[PDB]
Amino acid sequence: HHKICIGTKSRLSVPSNKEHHYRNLRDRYTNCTYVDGNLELTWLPNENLDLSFLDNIREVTGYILISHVDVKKVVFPKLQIIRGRTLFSLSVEEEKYALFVTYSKMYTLEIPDLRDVLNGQVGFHNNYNLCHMRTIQWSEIVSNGTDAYYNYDFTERECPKCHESCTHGCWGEGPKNCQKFSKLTCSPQCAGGRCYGPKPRECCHLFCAGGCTGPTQKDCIACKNFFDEGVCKEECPPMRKYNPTTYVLETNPEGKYAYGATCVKECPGHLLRDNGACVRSCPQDKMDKGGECVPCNGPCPKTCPGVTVLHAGNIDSFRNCTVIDGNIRILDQTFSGFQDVYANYTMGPRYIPLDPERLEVFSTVKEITGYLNIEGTHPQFRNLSYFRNLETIHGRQLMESMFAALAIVKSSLYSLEMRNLKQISSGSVVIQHNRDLCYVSNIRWPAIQKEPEQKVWVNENLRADLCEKNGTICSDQCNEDGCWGAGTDQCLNCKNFNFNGTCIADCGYISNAYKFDNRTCKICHPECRTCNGDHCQECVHV
């Protein structure tokens, strides 16, 4: 089977709860065959952790980083290809690494099926117990490298021989762990490339990546160019063919989209469709339609980059943004005065505390492509009416924990007030530990969530009974879907009648009372003061 993971880019971050970190890693990689990004295998103190969530990973597009891993036996039993499209280093001066194993206590690291590292280097740095790596002939695997990089200091067990049957080095004990060869055992005429046997003629294709199962093209393990239901192509079958006689772009029933070095019938949901390609953002002159990048009309909607943490120093950059291309994180430090730390742990600028009032800058925001994360605490930070015009959170990017698209945790909020929020396209709702927050438990989140597989974790906010005793419940004019707050304009869906954007029992409860259907009103024209449509009761002028 084939299944896609989004990789991570946390580099050397230390998780607080190492147990949730485990859960996160597990939830992320289980049954995944293909990592879009970097596989970061980090901080697993227990020696006997079961890492079988790694069991189906076949290819990684970025780098593999193994840091602070003390599980005795760490095996990647099906990993074949590390592409190294993005690489890892401790610093600017260090080598760029596709495989980096560092500060880990594992006794073995087994990748018996590993074939090829397409780009970057292999490094081992201060792993006290790791065995066999020097028996591995690395120029067999590393495409642009001689050997692995080793480093040991700070003060070394004797180490077992490879299995009887190995012709050369191994990744560990038993015959399954003997290094195989598909590049060094080949003859020339192969000009250094891979092959499925010793003799000439049988040198894979040229397009092949990681080697091959037979003669050519349809027989590759993976591809140096585009990969298409099994065959390597120089390009994906375009979505339309140009007929040079007729001057027509005829649509192609076998056309496909380029997603990375992959040809695909539809772009994965975390990317948009631009021409024949799956892309991360629309270009400057385009906008997002139905998941498709398309020329605009008037001015294009003012769209702004997200920031990694909101604070006094960067909040004004969202002035007039309609769409935010990225995430929004409002944290404690947002309010208390955010402090730049740099890698070398040299203190950067520090910004003044943020006055929640300034959050009003978001009132023009209609879309967030990433996620929205709220964690801060402030006396005057009591709701999300700042986002009263936000109508969709795409979640094309999710949080490290629980695949969250909306996470509200340990905040000082009393109500949401996000009256326009209609879709959370992807990912989950986490709303926990907000000591004064009501409403969230009576909101039917699946209503606004697009998929059934999307999840809801909403608890340990304000106890149901203690909201009810303050009247901080829904207006009796909301249906059972709940509300963002006590307002009549705060319902998800309306029980009786909806008018103007507010919610009424009658439709007759007001001067103008023209009914448009089962549930709806509308104003009685400029001229009527009272009507039901051309004609009415208490008239006006011209």
Ligand X SMILES: *[C@@H]1O[C@H](CO)[C@@H](O[C@@H]2O[C@H](CO)[C@@H](O[C@@H]3O[C@H](CO)[C@@H](O)[C@H](O)[C@@H]3O)[C@H](O)[C@H]2NC(C)=O)[C@H](O)[C@H]1NC(C)=O
Please, which residue, 134 or 382, has the CB nearer to ligand X? 382
Binding of residue 294 to its own copies (CB under 8 A): yes
DSSP, residue by residue, 33-102: -EEESBEEEEEE--TT---GGGTT--EESS-EEEEEE--SEEE-TT--EE--SS-B-SSTTSPPEEEEEE
Tokens (6 digits) for 57: 């990973």
| 383 belongs to the binding site for ligand X (CB under 6 A) | yes
Question: Between 213 and 380, whose beta carbon lies closer to ligand X?
Answer: 380
- In whole angstroms, give the CA distance from residue 209 to residue 141: 11
CB 347 within 8 A of CB 341: yes
Distance of alpha carbon 214 from alpha carbon 58, whole angstroms:
19
Task: State in angstroms the smallest separation of the CB of 248 from its own copies.
Answer: 6
Please give the Cα distance from 251 to 447 (Å, whole number): 36
Rule CB under 8 A: say whether 260 interacts with its own copies.
Answer: yes
Question: Which residue's entry shows tokens 């409002």?
Answer: 330
Q: How far is the CB of 93 from ligand X (least distance, A)?
A: 11
User: Toward ligand X, which CB reaches closer, 237 or 487?
Assistant: 487
Structure tokens at 477: 């004019």
Binding-residue total with ligand X (CB under 6 A): 11
For ligand X, the closer of residues 155 and 344 by Cβ is 344
With contact defined as beta carbons under 8 Å apart, do 193 and 182 qualify? Answer: no
The answer to whether 454 contacts ligand X (rule: CB under 6 A) is no
The nearest distance, CB 414 to ligand X, in angstroms, is: 6
Q: Does 541 bind its own copies (CB under 8 A)?
A: yes
- Measured distance CA(286)–CA(293) in Å, rounded: 6
Q: Which is closer to its own copies, CB of 5 or CB of 486?
A: 5
Stretch that binds its own copies, among 175-183, 292-300, 383-391, 455-463 (CB under 8 A): 292-300
Radius of gyration of the chain (CA): 29
Q: CA angle, corner 187, sides to 184 and 191, nearest 5? A: 85
Asked whether position 154 contacts ligand X by CB under 6 A, the answer is: no
CB 381 within 8 A of CB 409: no
Cβ neighbour number for residue 153 with a 10 Å cutoff? 6
Cβ atoms of residues 93 and 156 within 8 Å: no
Cα separation, 354 vs 85, in Å, equals 39
- Least distance to ligand X from the beta carbon of 380, Å? 6
Q: How far is the CB of 242 from its own copies (least distance, A)?
A: 5
Residues in Cβ contact with 38 at an 8 Å cutoff, skipping those fewer than 6 apart = 7, 8, 9, 60, 62, 63, 64, 65, 86, 88
Q: Contacts with ligand X in 411-450 (CB under 6 A)?
A: 414-415, 417
Taking residues 337 to 356 in sequence order and writing x for each that binds ligand X by CB under 6 A, - otherwise, the string is -----xxx-x----------
> x/- binding map, residues 261-280, to its own copies, per CB under 8 A?
x---------x--xxxxxxx
Residue 528 near its own copies by CB under 8 A: no
Mark 72-101 with x for binding to its own copies (rule: CB under 8 A) and - for no binding. -------------xx---------------
**What is the rounded distance in angstroms from the CA atom of residue 26 to the CA atom of residue 71?**
15
Say how many C-beta atoms besides its own lie within 10 A of residue 60's C-beta: 26
Is the Cβ of residue 92 or residue 542 nearer to ligand X in the bound state? 92
Span interacting with ligand X, options 209-217, 381-389, 399-407, 529-537, rule CB under 6 A:
381-389
Closest CA to 82 of 209, 212, 185: 209
Q: Which of 35, 258, 368, 374 binds its own copies (CB under 8 A)?
A: 258
Strand 347-350 to strand 339-341: parallel, antiparallel, or no bridges (unpaired)? antiparallel
Identify which of residues 218 and 382 has a Cβ nearer to ligand X in the complex: 382
Given its own copies, ligand X, none, residue 246, with its beta carbon under 5 to 8 Å by kind, binds: its own copies
Residue 141, φ and ψ in degrees, nearest 5:
-105, -40
Report which residue's Cβ sits closest to ligand X. Answer: 344
Q: How far is the CB of 199 from ligand X (least distance, A)?
A: 52
For residues 136 and 179, is the Cβ–Cβ distance under 8 A? yes
Nearer to its own copies, 118 or 448 (CB): 118
242 touches its own copies by CB under 8 A: yes
CA–CA dist 522, 510 (Å, integer): 11
Least distance in Å: CB of 467 to ligand X? 13
Residue type, 123: G
- Residue number, 284 or 346, with CB nearest to ligand X: 346
Q: Which of ligand X, its own copies, none does residue 382 bind (CB under 5 to 8 Å by kind)?
A: ligand X
| Site residues for its own copies per CB under 8 A | 85-86, 240, 242, 244-249, 258-261, 271, 274-281, 283, 289, 292, 294-295, 297, 540-542
| Site residues for ligand X per CB under 6 A | 342-344, 346, 380, 382-383, 385, 414-415, 417
